[PDB]
Amino acid sequence: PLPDSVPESEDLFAPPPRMQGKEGRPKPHIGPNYESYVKEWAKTVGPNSDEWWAAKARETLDWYDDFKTVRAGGFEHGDVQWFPEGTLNAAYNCLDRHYYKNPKKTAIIYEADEPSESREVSYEELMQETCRVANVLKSYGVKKGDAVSIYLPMTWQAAAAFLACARIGAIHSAVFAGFSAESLRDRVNDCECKVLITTDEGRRGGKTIATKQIVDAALQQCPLVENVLVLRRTGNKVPMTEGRDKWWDEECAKMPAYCPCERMASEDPLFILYTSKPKGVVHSTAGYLLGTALTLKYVFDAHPDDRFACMADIGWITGHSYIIYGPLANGITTAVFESTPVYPTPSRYWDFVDKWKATQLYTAPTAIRLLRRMGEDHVKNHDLSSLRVLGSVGEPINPEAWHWYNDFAGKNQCAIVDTYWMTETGSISIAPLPGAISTKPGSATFPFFGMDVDIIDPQTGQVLEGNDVEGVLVARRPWPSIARTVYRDHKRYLETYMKPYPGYFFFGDGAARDYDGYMWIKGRVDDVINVSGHRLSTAEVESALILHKGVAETAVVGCADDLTGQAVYAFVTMKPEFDLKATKEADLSKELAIQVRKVIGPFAAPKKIYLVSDLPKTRKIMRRVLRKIVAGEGDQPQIVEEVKQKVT
Amino acid sequence: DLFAPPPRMQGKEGRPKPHIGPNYESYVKEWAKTVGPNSDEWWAAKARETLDWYDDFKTVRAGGFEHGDVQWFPEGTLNAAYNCLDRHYYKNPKKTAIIYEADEPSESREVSYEELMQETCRVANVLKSYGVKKGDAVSIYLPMTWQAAAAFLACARIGAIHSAVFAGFSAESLRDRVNDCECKVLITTDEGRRGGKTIATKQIVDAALQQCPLVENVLVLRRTGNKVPMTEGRDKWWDEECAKMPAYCPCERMASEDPLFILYTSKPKGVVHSTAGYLLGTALTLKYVFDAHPDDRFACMADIGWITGHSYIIYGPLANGITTAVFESTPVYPTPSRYWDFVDKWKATQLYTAPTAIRLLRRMGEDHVKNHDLSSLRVLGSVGEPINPEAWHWYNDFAGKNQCAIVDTYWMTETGSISIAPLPGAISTKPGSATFPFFGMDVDIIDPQTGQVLEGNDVEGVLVARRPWPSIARTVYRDHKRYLETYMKPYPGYFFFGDGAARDYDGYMWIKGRV
Amino acid sequence: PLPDSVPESEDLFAPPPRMQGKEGRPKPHIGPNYESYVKEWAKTVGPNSDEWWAAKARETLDWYDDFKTVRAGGFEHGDVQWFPEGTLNAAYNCLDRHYYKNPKKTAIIYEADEPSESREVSYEELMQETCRVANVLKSYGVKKGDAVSIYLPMTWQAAAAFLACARIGAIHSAVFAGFSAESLRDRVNDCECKVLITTDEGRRGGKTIATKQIVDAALQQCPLVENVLVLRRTGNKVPMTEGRDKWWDEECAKMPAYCPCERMASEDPLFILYTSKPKGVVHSTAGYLLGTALTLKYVFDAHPDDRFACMADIGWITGHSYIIYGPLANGITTAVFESTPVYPTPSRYWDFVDKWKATQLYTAPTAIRLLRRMGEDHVKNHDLSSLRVLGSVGEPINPEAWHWYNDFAGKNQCAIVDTYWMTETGSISIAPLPGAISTKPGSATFPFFGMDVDIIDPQTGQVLEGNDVEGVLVARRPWPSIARTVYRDHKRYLETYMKPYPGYFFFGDGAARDYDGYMWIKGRVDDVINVSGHRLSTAEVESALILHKGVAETAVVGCADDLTGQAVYAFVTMKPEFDLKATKEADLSKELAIQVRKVIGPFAAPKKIYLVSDLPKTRSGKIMRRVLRKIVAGEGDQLSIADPQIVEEVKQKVT
């Protein structure tokens, strides 16, 4: 499905001199043209890819036991396997083997919230801190295969917390520091962890995150948790429960600074990551580790002495893959950025780049757009010439933001890599190789090694041949870092990703292939309602009403309201196998509204819930029609009258 | 009265050429390699060729009868589930692993290695989710449905010790075995079916569990879907539990001498077998005693609740990566032609049954067997008891149509694999005789009164073994003293089978039953 | 810091013919001179020592998985690592691999308390009993990483108890059989063990140790203990608690005689040993195992058919390293000695040596002092010629005891190895290599392979360069068998050993390095004093002072002298039934000197004769002659004591 050659220019930004091995920069791993990418990429998919993947696995990672089979399983039953017979350890490949080679080399550039508090953490320090925690965890009784929940802000010990679980064969489950008590509670209960690692307080952008207060509130509804390990990030007074709670530093003081590595099967679960019932995406060890290491080495052209600056949070897969696992497996310096893009000033990113001579920067378009609105003076006068690659992740990067990234952050001398992937992909799925691909602003370009993607017509289900087609993005074969299951919910795993288009992996995103073969991912434009000052998306309320099994389809719109600013109005149609006769229509309305209140909050409950035979549809739901009906525009295909009656 | 290997066992008529042949001299030449002073090289070669090891072994054998410290390949590590499922699935996932002959013939179907492995991994994941660890006993109470193999191999996959109880034992019999192994998880079925009759397995299980304080989880297979009593919390449905689990599960790396299973003989005597030696013994006996070849379809009509089902339904055949049969019905349901309807239906290449079944079908009449094809068969096996010459010829004349080799296989639960049997491509058979010992088996006749070994031929006495063999039972569960007393004390330096035996003038062994 | 060559003699005892490959004895592993020790020792420290240690690790031990890194970590944070990626099993290296090679070879010479009850235990028997116990422990639920407390006397099954824990990956915590219930309770609670292995009763020297009686008393305050496995050492009636207590023989009768080996990481903890708050010294598996195996092989010059007789107790690190792990790792015969040095007669050691033809003997100077007080008749007429190496461990050895060891046990044909080490060092740290190093009485000589020691001036904090310097002993680099932590108290570990002198390990003992470079722990001690050209032994001059009946004890020391080269200084204490009132103290000083002059000559009179209330002594009875030497030399400001006021009294009489 990929082009054999991408010609021409004038809308193509070719790899700049810094990515051509000129000006003393390293020669790129893949280059110099598109044909060089295809030549290698074809080796990683299709007929002889086993030889390629076996070689990369043995080169990239340190194994205790060699593997015999390269790959097995597939989408149909969710039995994906990569290098199944081999054994290894994530902590060994990210800490031990590098500490053995260069102990004093910096592993983490810890950019603290306050710039003066920033410092470098070496591989020796990170490993010793990781081993102390692992020894603490073993003393609590944590065994191989046990879940450990982590609720940590962007301080450097979070990597030690992750790697400690990976060291002993435990399954860490990171929860974004800043999640509510209810959100943390659901994830803690779902993974059935008995140990929680958290901090007393968080710090970000000069504001304090009351983590331990949130943890205490959440733990009241988490009966399984027995031990809490509390990092003294600020040292301020926080409530501590006797017996349950112990101090991280005090506990580590009793333990040795070395801890042996558990020999893990390639398919032993490495972690659970809940996407924002909670969906705990489960990743294996060897395939995920190889995927992060290879994507970092090629998508960002990382080289042995590089300093990689990913400004994401470890609560998202970006921090998992491209702050901790990817960079540390490659033995390079990685950045843990505790602050915000504009604290203390909108030059924070660029002070960081010149301070540490960062070679790659990896952030989200929301940060890029924020800095553009702050002004050129915060970026125009910096050096930034240590950078070679600038990365965008999380959402489409708009043409204005792409050029600002290129003109000021890169000074027209960096390659811009727009990366598309998901929590379930484990590593970057579609992204330009900076030394080979000429980029188009807003395009993720071409699939990574091991990714064989295609566009499927959502209506017919058939694969769209050729260019200038749009549909839904699918993958044809499993890749090493693919999620292996959803924790204790394999049925939801198969239904969500393997059932909708059989024989394929369903990303769930719209995509386009334009004319040169460049891939374009479509985003989401779900409407936003301002209820009493709170921004509610119509998707959340529609996703909340559908949890009532028996509801087939919903479409919520927003109308004006004299009391709340705006009100949520919801149209609901029940599934045929319901026979709604044991309940009056008003009983279901109260039931559904209470349901949304419990799951989104006391403000997202619909004002009126209209039960209708069917929603108005074309071939999507005509929400513009529904909005006008709620707003008294019936004066301005038969269901429309039915909807008018139920509203009037 | 000597039956030489027939044309189907000579490489004629398109059949595969036998592994050992064509004469007695060919059997002796290889057999001498497997016993005595320099046999370690042969066994080391066979162990490495037959099985997939995660870690190699250094020592071949150690220990002996005196203290029951038998060791084979002790430093090596491997997994029974890997050698029976994974390695074959990686080579040919669509190959039939189990021919599931249901009680109703129309409900029969083929289960691939892909399906058997996926189901095994799901159950293992359920067991791990229950907290089952390596070394834990798990009791299995299952009728002859194909998931019984998945249940067995799931325990072996995670290093648990499965303990099968024949579906049909009373609640007290199930209770005694469940309590003895101290298992906390029981795998059973809602109902079993055999011969048009329903086995109230879950009903029996509930009665037994009232006297089993240790059992915390019961995994209930929905074999029939009829309403059976289920205890909230304790009891869960097999399909619902597996629906939540992934279809792959990693293999626990097991020491060669890690226990593979407990099998209680009908105080309960729990015979314990290790992993590597048992696995190697069953695989070699199946390959040689039945002359199995890669595309063969092996039909052993035993029950998985007996050692015969353990060795020659599940472990032996699946280790060789061939097709094995799980026969849920009886020899005479729906008609006394069921065995022969089955053989032609699936083109079975070997049949393995008991003389009790042979005598049952012979008394039913020739009309049920004479008109079948049966020409896919090459070897007919008898096990469990001496086979009468009347029963032997009826087996040979109608089932084999005088074109199959008859293997009378003698062994015991404690031997793990076949001990004395003719090699079908080399040994000429005598009706009712087990002939000669298998590779690694060094047997002799001892004068029971004097305790001395009877030299020469045409002698009768008791059968003893001189050296341990790889698949020998290693102990009796938590009753090692009973193990030594029953087998190692009566004739010190020997293994005492407990059967009288005679060796004729030609050297053939004739088993005479118990002492 | 080490000498390149040790010259001369006359205070140097060169390796005797039994340690030269003469008289049919094996040629020593290191020899024949000091230069040969340095040539090998230099390979074990410094720049290229990883290659030497990697070779030794692979040659000495059987690994399930090979290691990649040789060493890492260090003193600063207590993250010491040796061969971290490798896997092995102590029970495999101590039992299985030797059993596979020679099953009938004697593993333990079990010398029972009654000599007639002694017998040989083969490797096959020891392994079978180890596997039976390990199987029992697994049935109790003991998992890899679980602590098991052991309270056992010196019966041979103690090795089976230890190695059973190592076989399944449990962490055994040995408690000296004879500790009170309170001492046993604290150790049992501190390691949080749930299984205790003990005996019904112990026997030593005709007296019975009421072990099960003590165990029951302690267990009343041990809520975590669920199972007690009781060895039937005597078969006498002992209280047994239903459920908790089971018989060792009965439990093993139900179990198989083989048990698979748990594949242990190099740095997996092998055992906890609490020193007499309790300090639980924790040792890893591979580094400890290699250290004990190498020290036994080289410090005692062990050979495949040797019979090693270490008379220690397994409740101490000496029993851990040089009864069980070291010798059994080398696959040789080891001795478990259940009796005392004087039961049934003070000739028990020498009856034992001739009975089993022991090739090395390893005991404590405290034991040597007991037998020396019993008389020469118990040793003069024995054979003892199967011995080649005589070892002393536990405390500084005075020259008088050293010569008695050398003259009678060795018949002046054995090398005496004075071994200095600690529970925290795991294996011998400083000791002569018997086939290469010439010995000085009372000196530990030179460091072992991998030990890089130095003397630091405590006042200045700087390391003392050169020879004839004394200060405190420190080690410069980690060694394989170093203890890795104090159980759940790593802060105490760093503070006790790594904080006092950063970058160094602080032994806590003073040491001196003489002009020849020999290390003297706790101080130099005098043997022969050269007064006006005559060689005087401290024994002769002390034997002369004791002829004055009324004198109870004397101890003469030597200092430099500008007129006689060296001067004899004598400390004398009179018998209680003397009533020293008819003579001024100066009158007795002249009288004693004239007596020594009359009996040894006009040159042997001591320069000063100090009358003191009592000589300084330790709780073991050792007269601290090293203290007395320092006091006479004006080092009372720098300087186990049973009476600390005796030292001050001595300082006053000298100053």
Ligand SMILES: Nc1ncnc2c1ncn2[C@@H]1O[C@H](COP(=O)(O)OC2CCCC2)[C@@H](O)[C@H]1O
């Ligand atoms: N380059 C991109 N262009 C357009 N959309 C993108 C792009 N990258 C991601 N997305 C959307 O993010 C979802 C995945 O979110 P998540 O699983 O939370 O992972 C987070 C953390 C890392 C990836 C986002 C996709 O399914 C898409 O909807």
Ligand SMILES: Nc1ncnc2c1ncn2[C@@H]1O[C@H](COP(=O)(O)OC2CCCC2)[C@@H](O)[C@H]1O
């Ligand atoms: N070919 C044979 N010829 C004569 N007797 C035989 C033969 N096979 C078995 N037996 C008797 O069955 C006992 C073993 O029974 P069991 O432990 O159930 O072993 C199982 C496995 C064999 C089938 C039952 C033997 O010891 C004998 O008594």
Ligand SMILES: Nc1ncnc2c1ncn2[C@@H]1O[C@H](COP(=O)(O)OC2CCCC2)[C@@H](O)[C@H]1O
């Ligand atoms: N040869 C020796 N010369 C001088 N002093 C010595 C000597 N051996 C020991 N010590 C002192 O005993 C402590 C160690 O005792 P310990 O840890 O119980 O180990 C015991 C058990 C094995 C080692 C002794 C040292 O630190 C010293 O004070």
Ligand SMILES: [Cl-]
């Ligand atoms: Cl790199």
Ligand SMILES: [Cl-]
């Ligand atoms: Cl085959």
Ligand SMILES: [Cl-]
């Ligand atoms: Cl040796």
